[PDB]
């Protein structure tokens, strides 16, 4: 039975104006092409003089020249060798060739999270062998990341963890070992060597991309030796008992390189394992107190807990902070488990590290707090103005959209819309904790993900993060790249909320820069399912201007009146319910 197996370009694609042919691949060998037309859908005129040629089960169509920003349909009726008839079509959009010219200092910022939990494991290692060596890959890919519009990359923890080569990076063992020393059965980390990493950073800086380090400062794991430790009278478990604590770290493999600091019992407030009784608990060490944290009793999380009241410990870790930026040339950090670490210490280190260099070091904390007020109150407590946080509040809205949400409420959702806190939001859709095959605390954004990316990447505030697993593993690249184009060239100037949002449609306006031609955009997203085209009358702030949907979804243009208003459209479906209207000229 006759069907189209695939086409190049694929239906829905955005293509180069230099596309020279369309290949259609069919199920059976093809006897005939009865009708073929390539149509410009804006003017509704067929391109005269196209040619085709039959090769077994393939049909190559050529002899055309496509205009930028134009939507085309290739319609065909073929008869196969068993006299089956198949009628069908493919559609595609041509990329803009002449983009708006944005002054380099105003270009929008955009982060790629360069990892996922199961990288280089199970089928992932099979289907994606290039990820057995992440530093080398990021090196290879720097120029295409930059072409995509990424301005920074957040790396997985680059230091040696307690599971060695299988450590995703959070079983922190040695901060000063970046896959330079044979420790935990491996010289390299799961991701590569120190040299490879230094390679990648040059690769990336070479293409004008920053590199953030994922600093896990709360705990330590895989200690070199155990120690007998008495537990405080205030310990929740086994108070005033003696336990055998895995608390000795001296990093034999590194042998003092970079830092000769070593760790024991007095470097930690406590632990969760007693190797005498072979029991888990929460164990507070004699004369230690849990450090000051936003919420009561949340210093203790897992592993051996760092005592950031200890001055020697504060000093070694401030020194590493500094080494990472000034010596290893990173441009910033993600701060794992930021609310489980002494707030006074986080402010002190953020200040020491910021103060040690002329570069403006970027900092973002992982504080999994879905209420905005609670999260602002955490920012207030830490009280260091450089401290950004991930907008888990906003993501809670994208979880709400999984089975339908009240879409007008996106006007006020997340840290990213809280007055006085909007620029401290690092917005995202999924990450390694929220999108993981097994053992997640949440549900991934498994539906309406494109809508959620469009919202964050068009916004005037915050800094958006794309997830590697979305972009490269679930293969959302094709659709994401169109949103990344929007952000890179169009999402500029003041942002405006509109007055006609409802249960199912949210629209938003970026007016463009006055002193830049052809930038600006109208976003419309929907959680509707009716399967059809809805309009909203929106003031684009650009009088007498022809716009088109750069997503390829709506195959018409919209021209605004002399007040700048126009009827902009979106398709109310899960699959295609996002549109981004940009100027054609």
Nearer to Ca ion by C-beta: 462 or 518?
518
Least separation in angstroms between residue 209's CB and Ca ion is 26
Q: Residue 316's binding partner, choosing from Ca ion, Na ion, none, with beta-carbon cut-off 5 to 8 A by kind?
A: none
Task: Answer yes or no whether residue 331 interacts with Na ion by CB under 5 A.
Answer: no
Interface with Na ion (CB under 5 A), residue total 5
Query: Which of the residues 332 through 351 are near Ca ion (CB under 5 A)?
Result: 340
For position 503 contacting Ca ion by CB under 5 A, the verdict is yes
CB within 8 Å of 537: residues ≥ 6 apart: 500, 565, 566, 567
Indicate which residue of 167, 214, 274, 366 is catalytic.
366
Rounded CA separation 397/418 (Å):
14
Q: Rule CB under 5 A: is residue 272 a binding residue for Na ion?
A: no
Closest by CA position to 430, among listed 406, 404, 449? 449
Q: Which of 252, 404, 494, 543 binds Ca ion (CB under 5 A)?
A: 404
Part of the chain binding Ca ion (CB under 5 A), chosen from 217-225, 242-250, 440-448, 563-571: 217-225
Tokens representing 523 are: 């976003």
d(CA 219, CA 305): 5
Q: Is 31 helix (H, G, I), strand (E, B) or coil?
A: strand
Pick the piece of the chain touching Ca ion (CB under 5 A) from 86-94, 132-140, 402-410, 442-450. Answer: 402-410
Distance CA 77, CA 363 (A): 57
Rounded to a whole number of angstroms, the minimum distance from the CB of residue 391 to Ca ion is: 21
504 binds, among Ca ion, Na ion, none (CB under 5 to 8 A by kind): Ca ion
Contacting residue, 299, 504, 519, 549, with Na ion by CB under 5 A: 299
Of the residues 131, 316, 319, 336, which is catalytic?
336
Options 28-36, 286-294, 414-422, 505-513: segment touching Na ion (CB under 5 A): 286-294
Q: Residue ranges of the alpha helices (H) in 329-448?
A: 343-356, 372-382, 392-400
| Cβ closest to Na ion, residue 366 vs residue 430 | 366
> For residues 337 and 445, which CB has a smaller minimum distance to Na ion in the complex?
337
Which residue number, 307 or 316, has a Cβ lying nearer to Ca ion? 307
Half-sphere exposure of residue 421: CA atoms within 13 angstroms, side-chain side: 26
Residues 571/573/576/578 CA torsion (nearest 10 deg): 60
516 binds Ca ion (CB under 5 A): yes
Cβ of 126: how many Cβ atoms within 10 Å? 8
Residues 180/253, Cβ–Cβ less than 8 Å = no
Rank residues 151 and 266 by Cβ distance to Na ion and give the closer one.
Answer: 266
174 makes contact with Ca ion (CB under 5 A) = no
CA atoms within 13 A on the CB side of 35: 12
* Residue 174 interacting with Na ion (CB under 5 A): no
**Residue 366 is a binding residue for Ca ion (CB under 5 A):** no
Q: Which stretch binds Ca ion (CB under 5 A): 14-22, 146-154, 265-273, 363-371?
A: 265-273
Q: Residue 527 interacts with Ca ion (CB under 5 A)?
A: yes
Please count the residues of this chain forming the interface with Ca ion, following the rule CB under 5 A: 16
Nearest alpha carbon to residue 144 among 484, 489, 450, 469: 484
Residue 269 interacts with Na ion (CB under 5 A): yes or no = yes
Q: What b/e readout covers 215-230, taking b as 16+ CB neighbours within 10 angstroms? A: bbbbbbbbbbebbebe
Q: Are 484 and 110 in contact (CB under 8 A)?
A: yes
Nearest by Cα to 481 from 88, 134, 148: 148
336 is catalytic: yes
Shortest Å distance, C-beta 190 to Na ion: 27
Stretch that binds Ca ion, among 18-26, 119-127, 135-143, 525-533 (CB under 5 A): 525-533
Of Na ion, Ca ion, none, which one does residue 519 interact with (CB within 5 to 8 Å by kind)?
Answer: Ca ion
Residue 336 in contact with Na ion, rule: CB under 5 A: no
From CA 190, how far away is CA 136, in angstroms rounded?
A: 12
512 binds Ca ion (CB under 5 A): yes
Q: Which of 305, 319, 504, 519 binds Na ion (CB under 5 A)?
A: 305
Contact call for residue 309 and Ca ion (CB under 5 A): yes
Q: Is residue 305 a contact point for Ca ion (CB under 5 A)? A: yes
Nearest to 282 by CA among 267, 261, 304, 263: 304
Query: Which partner, Ca ion, Na ion, none, binds residue 443 by CB below 5 to 8 Å per kind?
Result: none
| Secondary structure of residue 383 in the 3-state scheme | coil
Beta strand segments in 428-575, E:
463-467, 495-497, 505-510, 521-526, 533-539, 546-549, 557-559, 565-571
Considering the complex, state which of residue 274 and residue 519 has its C-beta at the smaller distance from Ca ion. 519
The residues assigned a catalytic role are 336, 366
Binding site for Ca ion (CB under 5 A): 218, 269, 291, 299, 305, 307, 309, 340, 404, 503-504, 512-513, 516, 519, 527
């Amino acid at each position: 039975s006759l069907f189209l197996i695939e086409s190049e370009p694929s239906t829905g694609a955005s293509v180069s104006k230099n596309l020279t042919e369309i290949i259609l691949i069919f199920s059976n060998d093809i006897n005939k092409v009865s009708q073929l037309a390539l149509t410009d859908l804006i003017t509704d005129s067929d391109i005269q003089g196209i040619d085709y040629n039959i090769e077994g089960n393939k049909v190559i169509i050529n002899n055309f020249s496509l205009e930028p920003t134009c939507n085309y349909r290739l319609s065909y009726e073929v008869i196969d060798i068993y006299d089956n008839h198949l009628q069908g079509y493919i559609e595609f959009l041509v990329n803009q060739s002449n983009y708006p010219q944005i002054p380099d200092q105003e270009v929008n910022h955009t982060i790629l999270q360069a990892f996922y939990w199961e990288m280089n494991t199970g089928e992932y290692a099979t289907e994606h062998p290039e990820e057995a060596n992440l530093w080398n890959l990021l090196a290879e890919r720097a120029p295409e990341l930059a072409e995509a519009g990424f301005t920074a990359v957040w790396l997985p923890p680059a230091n040696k963890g307690m599971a060695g080569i299988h450590d995703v990076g959070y079983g922190t063992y040695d901060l000063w070992d970046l896959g330079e020393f044979d420790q935990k059965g491996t010289v390299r980390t799961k991701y590569g060597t120190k040299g490879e990493l230094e390679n990648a950073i040059d690769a990336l800086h070479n293409n004008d991309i920053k590199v953030y380090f994922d600093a896990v400062l709360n705990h330590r794991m895989g200690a070199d030796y155990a120690e007998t430790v008495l537990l405080d009278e205030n310990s929740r478990d086994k108070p005033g008992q003696y336990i055998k604590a895995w608390t000795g770290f001296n990093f034999p493999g590194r042998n003092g390189e970079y830092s000769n600091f070593t760790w024991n019992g007095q470097c930690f407030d406590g632990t969760d394992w007693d190797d005498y009784s072979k029991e888990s608990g929460k164990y507070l060490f004699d004369e230690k107190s849990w450090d000051w944290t936003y919420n009561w009793d949340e210093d203790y999380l897992m592993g051996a807990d760092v005592d950031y009241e200890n001055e020697a410990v504060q000093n070694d870790v401030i020194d590493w902070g500094q080494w990472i930026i000034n010596n290893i040339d990173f441009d910033g950090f993600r701060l794992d488990a930021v609310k489980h670490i002494d707030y006074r210490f986080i402010d002190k280190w953020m200040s020491a590290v910021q103060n040690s260099s002329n570069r403006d070091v970027f900092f973002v904390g992982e504080a999994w707090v879905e209420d905005v007020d609670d999260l602002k109150g955490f920012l207030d407590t830490v009280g260091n103005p450089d401290l950004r946080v991930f907008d888990f509040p906003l993501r809670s809205f994208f979880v709400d959209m999984l089975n339908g949400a009240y879409m007008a409420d996106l006007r006020n959702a997340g840290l990213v819309n809280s007055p006085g806190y909007e620029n401290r939001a690092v917005t995202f859709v999924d990450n390694h904790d929220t999108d993981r095959d097994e053992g997640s605390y949440t549900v991934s954004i498994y539906s309406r993900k494109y809508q959620a990316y469009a919202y964050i990447l068009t916004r005037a505030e915050g800094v958006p993060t794309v997830y590697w697993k979305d972009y490269y593993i679930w293969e959302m690249k094709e659709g994401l790249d169109k949103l990344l184009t929007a952000r890179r060239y169009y999402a500029y100037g003041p942002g405006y909320e509109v007055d006609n949002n409802d249960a199912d449609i949210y629209s938003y306006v970026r007016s463009g820069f006055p002193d830049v031609a052809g930038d600006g955009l109208v976003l419309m997203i929907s959680d509707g399912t009716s399967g059809n085209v809805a309009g909203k009358w929106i003031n684009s702030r650009q009088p007498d201007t022809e716009f088109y949907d750069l997503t390829g979804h709506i195959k018409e243009h919209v021209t605004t009146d002399s007040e700048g208003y126009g009827n902009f459209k979106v398709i109310k479906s899960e699959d295609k319910g996002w549109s981004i209207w940009v100027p054609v000229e």
